[PDB]
Amino acid sequence: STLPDLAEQFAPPDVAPPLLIKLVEAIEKKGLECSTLYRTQSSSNPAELRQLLDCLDLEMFDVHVLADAFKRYLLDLPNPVIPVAVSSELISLAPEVQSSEEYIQLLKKLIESPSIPHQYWLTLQYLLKHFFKLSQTSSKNLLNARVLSELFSPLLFRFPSSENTEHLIKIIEILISTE
Amino acid sequence: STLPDLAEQFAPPDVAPPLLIKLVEAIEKKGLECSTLYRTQSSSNPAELRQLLDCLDLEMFDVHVLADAFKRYLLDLPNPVIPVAVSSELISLAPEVQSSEEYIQLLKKLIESPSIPHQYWLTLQYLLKHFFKLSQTSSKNLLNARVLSELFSPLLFRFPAASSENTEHLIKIIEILISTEW
């Protein structure tokens, strides 16, 4: 697993990692209306998917393989899209905080910290925009913000169930809806 | 006071921050043989030097202003080229770690940590290449690797520490890394 850090894959003024852009654009070209997108088991194994995340046009691949490589990419980032410091803070507040708007404002403040490269928040925004675009054909693909949040929150936060973890999933659900 | 983190200023396959490349190339074009390069102050103050670290072609500036803006850049980085995580570990090493080679081996392992983006080590290497190129016209500019390490180690590490046999060891590895570039 040689996937570089998000901060090593691109820098401002680019808006997202180029590999993630290739994946997302190919998936939206081929899979926007697919009623099992991102919910189907992997026909390929991790080693083969990793091969794909090095090398040529991603439209040539089966869309269910692209969706798996997308998941593989989020799992192989050496640090997750939402860093563990951020997750740890949000989780340790949950008995005491319940306001979703407060968690959301705090997620933005934590992830835009000077100690965290801006690439992390830029990537999260690119992901949220993808997830939101999927949710606009949810009558066909069955992916609304809530389902997208249950699928991807564990890959974004990198967590394997309290009222806490539920609060993280709800944050992502609201963040997808309000784009 | 602005200046983004090294890891936001560029990314692989670029080898260094674009602003730092402009500074180093202009300084080497105009000052390679200058016998007081980096050892004299210019008239400009930090606010004026920071002003320069935004806007023209840097070859237009006085070479002593460029040299001061270089120092200003290393000082205004939100984290130093060699992060405090790395310095804290290197300073904690025992006298039984007598070995310059071991200090260097530990610097490389710690700075290439997954917690530290590759941009930090890449910038350090770009700087070492500059310093090495300076030490090769030492017969004219009077700079050897050891003096370049005494001048720039406090800017690369940015570390308040009493002058110990540890800090002597940090100055020493920078000295060695400058010489062993080519």
Numbering used by the authors:
A (entry chain B): 113 to 167, 172 to 276, 279 to 297
B (entry chain A): 113 to 167, 172 to 298
Direct quotes from the study:
The p85α protein serves as a regulatory protein for both p110α and PTEN. The p85α protein contains 5 domains, an SH3 (Src Homology 3) domain capable of binding proline-rich sequences, a BH (break-point cluster region homology) domain, an N-terminal SH2 (Src Homology 2) domain (nSH2), an inter-SH2 domain (iSH2) and a C-terminal SH2 domain (cSH2). Importantly, the BH domain of p85α, either alone or together with the SH3 domain, also mediates binding to PTEN via a distinct interaction that does not compete with Rab5 binding. The p85α protein can dimerize and these dimers associate with PTEN, protecting it from ubiquitination and proteasomal degradation to stabilize PTEN levels.
A unique feature we noticed in the bovine p85α BH domain structure that was not described in the previous paper, was clear electron density for two sulfate ions near residues K224, R228, H234, W237, and Q241. The residues involved in coordinating the pair of sulfate ions within the bovine p85α BH domain are conserved in the human protein and they adopt similar positions within the structure, suggesting it may also contain a novel binding site. We generated, crystalized and determined the structure of the p85α-BH-R228E protein (2.4 Å), containing a mutation in a potential sulfate binding site residue. In this crystal structure, one of the sulfate ions was clearly absent, and the remaining sulfate ion reoriented itself within the site. No other major structural differences were observed. This result is consistent with R228 contributing to sulfate binding. We recognize that sulfate binding to Arg is very common in proteins crystallized from ammonium or lithium sulfate solutions, but the distance between the two sulfate positions (7.1 Å) is similar to that of the two PO4 groups (6.8 Å) in inositol 1,3,4,5-tetrakisphosphate, raising the intriguing possibility that this surface may recognize phospholipid head groups. The docking model predicts that p85α-R228 makes contacts with peptide backbone main-chains C250 and D252 within the PTEN C2 domain. Both the p85α-K225E and p85α-R228E mutants showed significant reductions in PTEN binding without altering their ability to stimulate PTEN lipid phosphatase activity, whereas the p85α-Q221E mutant behaved like the wild type p85α protein. Several of the p85α BH domain residues that can bind a pair of sulfate ions are also involved in mediating interactions with PTEN, suggesting that if phosphorylated lipids bind to the p85α BH domain at this location, binding of lipid and PTEN would be mutually exclusive.
